[PDB]
Amino acid sequence: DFLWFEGIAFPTMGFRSETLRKVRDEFVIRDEDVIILTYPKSGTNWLAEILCLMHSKGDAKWIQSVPIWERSPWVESEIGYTALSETESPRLFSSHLPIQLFPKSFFSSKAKVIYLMRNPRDVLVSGYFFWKNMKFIKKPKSWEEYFEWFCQGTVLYGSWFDHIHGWMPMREEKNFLLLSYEELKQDTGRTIEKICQFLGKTLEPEELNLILKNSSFQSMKENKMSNYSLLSVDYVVDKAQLLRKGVSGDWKNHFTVAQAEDFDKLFQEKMADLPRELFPWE
């Protein structure tokens, strides 16, 4: 099962309805906050690690000594809700909340949000493999069942189409940056430069080079704090697996031509009201 709150499914561990209500209604957003906004499995941790490394000008001291989920906690989670109000600025944190569930306090604030979007065919695949070792998530019978869950929106954090619809209006706001996992992957340095300019920071060539080096798929895979290897056995069976493949386009190795034709039609029906140029793929 899931924890159901306002029509959206949430994990059965680490979340409470009472907290999620305070998150929306009471949680105080500071103008100095930097917030990562993802639909789950769109590169959230990648971007957190880039962000932590921009902040230290490439120096890996803190990403190797602090668990990634303390460095950029989930505001909607109990532990993150609680930790953040005790944390001095500048706070970095994450959320997979749809706009209507996001702390109301943000909309009168100057806080900076980075929304990362990803091809949902890739998010679908990424999630499909990830949820398997998680002890507390409802597992699909099959690739085909998960595919149908994903398309219907009856998955952790609701529909991708909905998530995206509801955040996209913000793209015209000065304190909203819209990125894609695709562009981040294609030109990581250019993207990091884009993030600096938005955040009003500069980096010297040497510092950028070291953030490229230290946020690589392999650095992260090898970093105990970042690879999810520290999760309790209360949460997970065997290990990880956050860092699976780390590319765009893996959906083609898993969708059948018939699945692909159906998603195309579904995607085309649901995203008709938004500009096609918004979506890098494909």
Place this chain on the structure above:
Amino acid sequence: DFLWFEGIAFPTMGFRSETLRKVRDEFVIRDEDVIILTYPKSGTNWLAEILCLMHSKGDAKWIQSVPIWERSPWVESEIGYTALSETESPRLFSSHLPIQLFPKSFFSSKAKVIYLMRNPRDVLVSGYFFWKNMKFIKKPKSWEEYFEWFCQGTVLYGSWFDHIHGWMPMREEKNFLLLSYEELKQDTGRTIEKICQFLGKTLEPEELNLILKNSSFQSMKENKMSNYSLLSVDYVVDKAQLLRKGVSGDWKNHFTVAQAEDFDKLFQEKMADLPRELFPWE
């Protein structure tokens, strides 16, 4: 007994020649640092508390839960030197170092330093009473003996006249703010606003009012974290007394007329090569 390093006396506890060398030669200043530079008793802890409060926008949560010397460590102290390497940006910290002893690394950085200057007659008095409860400082036989030490510069951190001379040439640098205790005391709100503009920050009226409220002499005297009441008894007899009187002009209550005339003569002979408009007394 003092620890003597480069012709400058340092406390018998908490300091090492070897560390002090690395402070000058090896300690790395980040462009995100905010540093308070004072000759001891110019108002270091009051500046520290204000800055902490500017950072939290008036919210006293962290000043009441973290010791002031941990919120703003002495870079030259052993504990400070070490703790700061491990601290994430933005770092706030304090120094009483004359320029020639200060991290060389600062001089190629954009780190912002706030120099706080105070009437040395008032500094003399503040130190005179302060040192009495401290177990590890060489104490004077009399008001007169201490007066003589201070004038000669044979006190912790050396001459006030030298300290001041060393740092003044910086007053023209973009990343240097020169303040006095006198102006901070006379118009606190306006001084805080001057620091904001320096540090590139804005505050809402309500936030300023809370910083004014919470950085008051009485708030600080009442705050267990800020008033030295936590100092280990392996450091002090009785308690405190950091929060003594909290005004300028108290030196008149202690200097005999003969001392005032001698000090005037000396101050006039030493500060002649500097513009008098630079010292807002008196």
